[PDB]
Design a protein around this nucleic acid. Structure first.
Length: 49
RNA sequence: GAAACUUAAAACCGUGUUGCACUGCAACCCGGAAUUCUUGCACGUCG
């Protein structure tokens, strides 16, 4: 991509979601949205009308 | 016997509280039942 050997740096960093104290954790709204894709694919990848 | 008013004049009047004492008062919960709840991946796309 310009050969021009460009070398990039760390300009921006996206942050993990943390507790009000400062420690990371995993929400329960994220895992339940995964289980609404496992059950909603097993009824559509196994068989369908 | 025929002829001459027991008549005249005179307030049933004057004074006087339907007045004195007396609580529309005592007792009584605007009280008993009721979830601001149900569904929702901070994620997708890279000459």
């Amino acid at each position: 991509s310009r050969m021009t050997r460009k070398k990039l740096t760390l300009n921006e960093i996206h942050a993990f979601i943390k507790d009000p104290l400062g420690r990371p954790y995993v929400p329960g709204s994220t895992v339940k949205g995964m289980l609404r894709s496992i059950y909603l694919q097993s009824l559509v990848h196994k068989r369908t009308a």
